[PDB]
From a paper:
We also determined the crystal structure of the catalytic region of lpWalK at 3.2 Å resolution in the absence of ATP/ADP. The CA domains reach out, causing the ATP-binding pocket to be positioned further away from the phosphorylat­able histidine His391 in the DHp domain; we therefore defined this structure as representing the open state of WalK. The structures of both CA domains are similar to that of its close homologue S. mutans VicK. It is also similar to that of B. subtilis WalK. The major differences were the positional shifts, by up to 4.6 Å, of the loops and α3. Indeed, a global alignment of lpWalK with the open chain of smVicK indicated an ∼4° rotation of the CA domain relative to the DHp. A dramatic rotation (∼46.1°) of the lpWalK CA domain was observed when it was aligned with T. maritima HK853 in the open state. The DHp domain is sandwiched between two CA domains. In the open WalK structure the DHp is completely symmetric, with two straight α1 helices, whereas in the closed WalK state it is asymmetric, as characterized by helical bending in one α1 but not the other. We observed that two straight α1 helices of the DHp domain from the open lpWalK were randomly bent by 16.7–26.8° during 50 ns of simulation, indicating that the bending is an intrinsic property of the α1 helices.
A typical TCS is composed of a sensor histidine kinase (SK) and a cognate response regulator (RR), which are encoded by genes that are often clustered in the genome. Modulated by stimulating signals, an SK first performs an autokinase activity and phosphorylates a conserved histidine in its DHp domain. Here, we sought to determine the crystal structures of a WalK homologue, lpWalK from Lactobacillus plantarum, which shares 60% sequence identity in the DHp and CA domains to our previous solved smVicK structure, in different conformations in the presence of ATP analogues or ADP. The catalytic region of lpWalK contains one DHp domain (amino acids 370–450) and one CA domain (amino acids 450–624).
Residue numbers in the entry:
A (entry chain B): 386 to 479, 483 to 561, 572 to 610
B (entry chain A): 386 to 479, 483 to 561, 573 to 610
Write the structure that this text describes.
């Protein structure tokens, strides 16, 4: 599409600029060279991600993806993920807190650990990105009906109620595929994923899993 | 589809390696840094081209590509392209010759100068790259029947007659230049094809409506 290849074109040409800058001499100058190099690094990793997600949406949707399913404890799992995010957030130069509300009963669900961790990641990420003033990101885990409900909420920028359903279609606004990922994955893990937001009260992404 | 994302994945991870190398300190060292940067440069430009080709087949497949058609002199045109290639080959640190045989009647055809230039380029490229022992790349331009015939030949590695037809199918060995040229020429209302004998050589033909 004019869309995808151009959305790949952008960081490429970006990279081209920084690289050109170094090549023409910037590499010799210590005031800019590490910095420019860092930008190049980031752009590259970004593109590898975009590529990989593109690929997973090629193999998952079209649709031959071996999904490694284990009976995992989501209490621990969610705590691991949130730990990693707390670690990235505490070494920042800006500012974010993680408000955990996990039920006191240990829950076990049939999920792919790696693919679900990539889910939780993508959603936490998109949350922090739609929360410009910072503050608290709220993460809940509790059961109902034999749904295990994970919910992740930000009190940042709202989300248009006119477009609330299409957040899960490909590239709806660090890559812009994380939602497509999580939706597809969760759907495959046999759960349901959706969003509820009031502009600009805040945003909340829901995940539901078959409990037993 | 996994193919495309793998052919994009490779130079990316390449880039990652070189970039990482520099970032960890290589930039401070003058013996490797210009060189590593040259690699990064090349890989990046490469990826941009691959993107563009992908995109041109995205607009061509869906036929959403306005092809800017002019009545051009292919004699001069081919001479321009071959001039550029002669400059590229003469400013090299390695070996290649351009054998021009252009008919002495000036021919004019309805073509998109730029897209046909990318054709001639892609094919000349496939010639120079597929000529491991080096030597001469042969470029002919002559009319027949009201065909304008361009032919470009290399005396390098042959091309298997068992798979000789699929050189123009998507991603047969950036790796899309052939798909480009084929599609473009078809769109310019001409015909494109290949004839090769391993390992005598390879020869790409282009035919255009002459009048």
């Amino acid at each position: 599409v004019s869309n995808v290849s151009h959305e790949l074109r952008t960081p490429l040409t970006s990279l081209r600029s920084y690289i050109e800058a170094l090549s023409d001499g910037a590499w010799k100058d210590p005031e800019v060279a590490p910095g420019f190099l860092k930008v190049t690094q980031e752009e590259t990793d970004r593109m590898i991600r975009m590529i990989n997600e593109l690929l997973s949406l090629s193999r998952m949707d079209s649709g031959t993806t071996r999904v490694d399913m284990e009976l995992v404890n989501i209490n621990e799992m969610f705590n691991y993920v949130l730990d990693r995010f707390d670690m990235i957030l505490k070494k920042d130069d800006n500012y974010y807190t993680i408000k955990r509300e996990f039920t006191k009963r240990d829950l076990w669900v049939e999920i792919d650990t790696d693919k679900f961790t990539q889910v939780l990641d993508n959603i936490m990420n998109n949350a922090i990105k739609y929360s410009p003033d910072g503050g608290v990101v709220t993460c809940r885990l509790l059961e109902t009906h034999n749904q295990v409900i994970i919910s992740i909420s930000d009190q940042g920028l709202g989300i248009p109620r006119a477009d609330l359903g299409h957040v899960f279609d490909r590239f709806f606004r660090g890559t812009g595929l994380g939602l497509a990922i999580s939706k597809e994955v969760v759907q495959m893990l046999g759960g349901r994923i959706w969003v509820d937001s009031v502009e600009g009260k805040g945003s909340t992404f829901y995940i539901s899993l078959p409990y037993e």
